[PDB]
Symmetry: C5
Subunit: 254 residues, 5 copies
């Protein structure tokens, strides 16, 4: 593998520590702020906490992996041979991606067919991660065909999730007040922006653009930014929607 300078290793280490601290803070906030909203939305906040808890644990492992993957030697960071690859992140995703959609459904309080919509979204998310995993461990050079096939098969449930978010949930969003509608539309925009990061990284790794110390650093920093935005800030938006709906129906504990 490529050698890293002190600054490159430090940048990746700092961004991983930032992700760990963000998940710990988000967990504390969701647990304690569950009591601030009406009792009807607390379940949704519970799920938010689970997400930032799981990712938190996983990031604590990833950080430990990163330190173990390099050794300091003559003012350079030289790979030790201990593995460090994105495949481990899939273990996080298979739990967090289905839970994320779950909280969005829970806070929405769908009047009809809530169970069927939630079940189909959870199945789509699980299938997306499960089909993505075999392509990720495929070597982009020796096994390009397998990587392309698995990525294309993984994109189908991703498109189904986007369709359900923008087409089915439109009519449910339209039944909320203006404040709640703005918050829900902003939450949907935050999914689209953050979730496309992962397929783009997969595609760049398929075309062999991720070689080099620069690319290695950028991908880890992008993972930390994307995970924090898609989990902690996403849960904060869920909390904001729950608080607004509690204020609308007069169920706010304050």
């Amino acid at each position: 593998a490529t050698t890293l300078t002190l600054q490159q290793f430090s940048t990746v280490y700092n961004m991983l520590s930032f992700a760990v601290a963000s998940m710990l803070g988000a967990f504390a906030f969701f647990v304690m702020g569950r009591k601030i909203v009406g009792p009807k939305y607390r379940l949704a906040l519970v799920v938010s906490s689970l997400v930032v808890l799981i990712a938190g644990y996983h990031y604590w492992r990833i950080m430990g992996s990163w330190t173990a993957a390099y050794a300091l030697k003559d003012g350079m960071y030289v790979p030790t041979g201990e593995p460090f690859n994105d495949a481990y992140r899939y273990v996080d995703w298979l739990l967090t991606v289905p839970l994320l959609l779950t909280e969005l459904v829970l806070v929405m309080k769908l009047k009809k067919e809530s169970g069927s919509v939630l079940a189909k979204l959870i199945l789509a998310a699980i299938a997306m991660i499960a089909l993505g995993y075999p392509g990720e461990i495929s070597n982009p050079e020796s096994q390009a065909g397998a990587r392309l096939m698995w990525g294309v098969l993984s994109t189908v449930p991703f498109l189904y999730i986007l369709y359900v978010l923008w087409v089915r949930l439109g009519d449910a969003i339209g039944e909320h007040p203006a404040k709640v509608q703005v918050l829900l539309k902003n939450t949907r925009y935050l999914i689209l922006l953050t979730w496309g990061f992962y397929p783009i990284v997969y595609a760049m790794g398929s075309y062999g653009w991720l070689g080099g110390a620069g690319s290695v650093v950028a991908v880890q920093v992008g993972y930390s930014i994307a995970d924090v935005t898609a989990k902690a800030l996403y849960g904060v938006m869920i909390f904001a929607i729950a608080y607004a709906k509690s204020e609308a129906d007069g169920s706010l504990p304050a």
Copy 2:
């Protein structure tokens, strides 16, 4: 022992980390969602949390064992001589298996003879694990007779547990509304499917089919899947039954 490739070791490590994260998330969810159901069912949820807490600790140990059982050497994972065997899992089972049945009884609110049914189930579960343990540490080649005898003796309380689940608890299940009856029958199906995994693994290890890196990987992955399904998803079903019964009697805090 057999040497592992990078992918085989990574697969086992990732599945163990997945089990740890699943137990931690389940624990947080049961603790926080205890307040979402009526006060009559909270004790049941408490027991659910205990299960996912205990298994969680144990999986954190198993993961640590797995890393200690192999060393990276010339792009292969070579056994270090530190032990790694299924016997340690029995220490988990002796607590979790009696507790699992316990929560199913607690959420059911048996009108008569609840204590006697629960006591007999707990004794059956303890006896099953206690008789299974001597056969597991029996060498399948030198001590085949002892392994067969202990497995057969362990299966008797297993059959008694299945009989009590399907024959005694039928009349109690029939006294619930349709939603609760569907949830209880699905919970019983989830026990039968997940619990048979363990005796099948024991029997395959008795016939010498578990040699080889492939079998080693498959058994650990199957253990992680079976444990997560039989503890975290099982507790989620217990939570669903408690929520449905709270909604039926008008005791839902919301």
Copy 3:
């Protein structure tokens, strides 16, 4: 010291891990089930949690000691020279034994002289452990006289505790309903059975019967069984008595 086989070391390690998991589960259960009983008994449950918390920490240390006391070498476990002896357990006992009696008094709600009875029991327990400690560190061969003297002096407060349990607390037990009387008598029987284990181990170590790998394994397994029964199951019985008394006076939150 004697060398251990793989199975002997594994058995001791598994029993220590079992004790750790049991104390962690008991702690979670007592903390969460405090809200299930009436407010008059919650203090008693609090003390229960403290016991299983303290022992839990101590067992986490003992486990760490055991691994450090032996090294794997030619398929045998050879002592490293790092100490491992029962004296460390006394540090646990000096806190847990006075607290155990405390919870039994607290749940009992003595009408008169509760303070004096509790104070005398706490002083007796402290004196018992404090007089036992100098005899334990006495070499059974070179310092037999000192060991005998300290054990005999330690037994006097033990007999006083048994006398107070069976003679003073008889009249208080007789003032409870039949269910509560059965639970209290069973709790008293559980003390007598579990508490005699420790003096028997001390006496066997005084007569030089504890040499050999078999004896070493048996004593650690017996310590784990006795501690779990005398702390976690004892607290569960305290919880059962509190729940029964809450149901009797109509103070049950459910």
Copy 4:
């Protein structure tokens, strides 16, 4: 790097441990004292806890770094070559500085334009830390120009934050009773005093005054004092303002 005497290393280690203990105590206090004030201010206290939680984690890392940066050798502490620099602290600041201002807004209960003021302050704080980071990793000798430019660009949002604190928030402060006005003015004075420490350290590092064991020790001790005062004591003042306002409107739970 310069060698440290035993006393210099010990002083830095003790001050880091002090910061860790202070953040842990502050976290426990804010979590438990949230229930002591009226429900209208609890959200503010929640944010306080998040701050002392995040910094706590980060200080636990910094302490671990410091021990790793030196080795004991011939009664002197000699640098090992493992890095130890202030850049890691920026990862803490980017979360804590926006949250600190947040709690001050939350406890204040701005009647109009609360959202816009809070958003502008959060953006200013993020920009301040983000522009400060490139100058900190700039070598003060080889890259003086870049360090000066980044520091000057970082000071603009700092001045905007001070202006908003003293000019916009004046009219809001004037609408509180005398006790609350005194507490708010003291809180504003505590920001000005503690926050200027960081730019002064940056400027001293730009002029090359931070060489030498004395300067190294003083800067770490100053960081610990400044962080504890600006986070734990600042949150205690937030708690005092919340308690005073709860007492003023008769919402105190006691």
Copy 5:
């Protein structure tokens, strides 16, 4: 430094572990028993928890230091050269000593000038520890003058604290019922007895009486006993006073 026998090292290690377990148990008890007293006294209990939490963390460090300060070699414990001295304890004291007095004021509910009395006591405690620290790191042989001067300057605020405890707080104590007066006087006696331990150890270290393995062991055991009595048992007395005052005014939740 002096070599230790197995028993001397074991005694110090066991007493440090005892202090850790005592602080953890005290923390759990204060957190859970806060709900058992009236809402007017809960803040006081919160502060109690903070004390036993901080000391707990610090003792976990001290224990780790002690193990690191010696190595097992030929059945003796030989110093490794890693430092172990009392100066680190001052980092604990500077937080815990001001908090201890704080809880005593908080539970007392001073009718007039509570703020001024508490502020003066906190300032006196901080000054006492801050003036003690420079004398502790003074070598008792080469720097006897500095040690004497710093100790004498540290004793002045100690005498002021004792004067405030016995002279100002007399009239406030006289306004409580007989039970509360007895508890307050016993709490004052527990301060005087436990707090004089520290200056006596300082004075003995000034006269060179602390050399030798015996003295080394005795001082650590005395520190553990004094800290446990002055923090955990002191908080238990605070809890007893709060419970008695809750029972007196009819604010007991039970």
